Amino acid sequence: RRRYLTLVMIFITVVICYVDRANLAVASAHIQEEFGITKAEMGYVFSAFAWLYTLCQIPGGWFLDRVGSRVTYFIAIFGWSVATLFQGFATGLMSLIGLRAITGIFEAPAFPTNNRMVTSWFPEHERASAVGFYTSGQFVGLAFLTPLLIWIQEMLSWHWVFIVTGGIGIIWSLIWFKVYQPPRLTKGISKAELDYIRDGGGLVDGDAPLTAKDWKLVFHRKLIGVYLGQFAVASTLWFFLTWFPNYLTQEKGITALKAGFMTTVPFLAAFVGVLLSGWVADLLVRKGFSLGFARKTPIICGLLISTCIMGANYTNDPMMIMCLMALAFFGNGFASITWSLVSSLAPMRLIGLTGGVFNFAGGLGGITVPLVVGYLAQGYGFAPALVYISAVALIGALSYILLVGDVKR
Ligand SMILES: CCCCCCCCCO[C@@H]1O[C@H](CO)[C@@H](O)[C@H](O)[C@H]1O
Ligand SMILES: CCCCCCCCCO[C@@H]1O[C@H](CO)[C@@H](O)[C@H](O)[C@H]1O
Ligand SMILES: O=C(O)[C@H](O)[C@@H](O)[C@H](O)[C@H](O)CO
């Protein structure tokens, strides 16, 4: 029982990763207040992380390949942890963009190293449950830590939100460097436990032209719907990781302290949507259903749900705002599961490429919505932004139910 402890350390790093994404949403109001930047300029601050994140992913694969999984993880954690620690001492605007950008650099190869690690640390049948553990759990981490930082932000200056988050990361990097090592090079493991992995699957030792014809295939009536769909899934997720705290603070005039305890229900609602979707996956086909309709239904329904974010601007009651926000985020988590489906639509050759472009579509949804909300909220308040997301969600839903009636193989 040493195989899981690794998964526990990966889960912690996924949380620390997403805290350093949402840690800014906490201090958005104060940073904006102190530095006196405009809503639209703040939109560029939120986005700074997303730009390089998507760009520094195909270079992240290179660095990873030629540097390894262990060491590459330490450089990343330490890299962005230092970059996050100094987000607390930033002054002006340009200082923040660079730190957010740098954070996006070292945090971009986060997942690829995970997939390369769970591969060698767990068999095949335990892999789907392994990734679902730390991706589903990430929202639990944001649910309990987001009210904490806000409470720290309301007790201590917003800087300490970044000093804490950054300092912790600097410490976890050092922990990772010692404890972690491939299953083969992991003392305390069990002789039979390792054989289970090796015989079961995974590389316990470790992991060891372009024609424009593909472009025409990669861009398919079925695959565009997948891209526009993921673009919409990422649009909503990055709103909750950025503008959602300040939304309640400014638009609805909720006290940051109450808005800090109102944000732990939506992040938990996401944790359920993810799991409840993975359960409807097995469940449907189990009752004699095709696989395409089995995975399409959670995605389409969840995005049609997301349309409920629009309803929040028609009420000023916390519980009703907190209920509607929790239902939309549930739809996002319930419709989040795509790539494994997208892997079964691209040709056997382009499974690797589709990922990069497929995520780019997602990462593209995270670059747009912060600028859109920042620009919209600057001039017309936060009301015209929630209709955009409900729209996008409706386009992503229409884009999935019309453009993907069946699967290509
Ligand atoms: C004013 C901000 C300057 C940006 C600094 C962030 C990058 C740190 C540069 O050091 C190292 O350089 C190598 C290649 O140059 C990288 O492979 C490695 O990941 C990185 O750790
Ligand atoms: C650029 C920043 C990246 C943020 C990612 C937000 C969009 C999520 C991508 O969809 C993912 O599809 C997987 C298929 O298995 C699911 O398991 C997983 O739950 C889901 O998250
Ligand atoms: O699956 C996820 O959790 C992300 O959305 C991915 O799209 C990453 O951006 C990257 O592709 C890692 O594989």
Quote the domain boundaries for residue 376: 1-409
123 phi-psi bin (left φ>0, alpha ψ -120 to 50, beta other): beta
Of 267, 242, 324, which is closest to residue 47 (Cα–Cα)? 242
The answer to whether the CB of 362 is under 6 A from ligand 3 is: yes
Whose Cα sits closest to atom 21 in ligand 2? 336
From ligand 2's centre to the CA of 336, what distance in Å? Answer: 6
Resolution of the experimental model in angstroms, please?
2.9
Give, using CA atoms, the residue closest to atom 14 of ligand 1: 63
Distance CA 226, CA 406 (A): 12
Quote the number of domains for the chain: 1
CA dist 127 and 200 (Å) reads: 11
Which residue, among 248, 231, 207, 260, has the nearest Cα to 342 in the 3D structure? 231
Chain breaks in the chain (C to N over 2.5 A) after: 208
Distance CA 85, CA 163 (A): 5
**Experimental method of this PDB entry:** X-ray
Q: Which residue has the tokens 């620390």?
A: 16
Residue 157 tokens, joined: 């200056």
Q: Ligand 2 center to residue 362 CA distance, Å?
A: 8
Which pairs count as long-range contacts for 27-34, CB under 8 Å and 24+ apart, including other chains? 27/153, 27/158, 27/161, 27/162, 28/242, 28/243, 28/245, 28/246, 29/245, 29/246, 29/249, 29/250, 29/256, 30/153, 30/157, 30/158, 31/96, 31/158, 32/246, 34/158
Pair 104, 123: CB distance under 8 Å: no
CB atoms < 10 A from the CB of 285, how many? 15
Whether the Cβ atoms of residue 231 and residue 359 lie closer than 8 Å to each other: no
**With a 6 A CB cut-off, is 332 part of the ligand 3 pocket?**
no
Tokens read off for 7: 């998964």
Asked if 140 contacts 267 with a C-beta cutoff of 8 angstroms, the reply is yes
Atom of ligand 1 nearest to the CA of 106: 19
Closest CA to 146 of 46, 237, 264, 238: 264
> How far is Cα 134 from Cα 267, in angstroms, rounded to an integer?
14
Burial (CB count <10 Å: 0-12, 13-18, 19+), residue 68: middle
Q: Is the beta carbon of 172 within 6 A of some atom in ligand 3? A: no
Q: What are phi and psi of 58, to 5 degrees?
A: -85, -25
The CB density around residue 192, as the number of other CB atoms within 10 Å, is 7
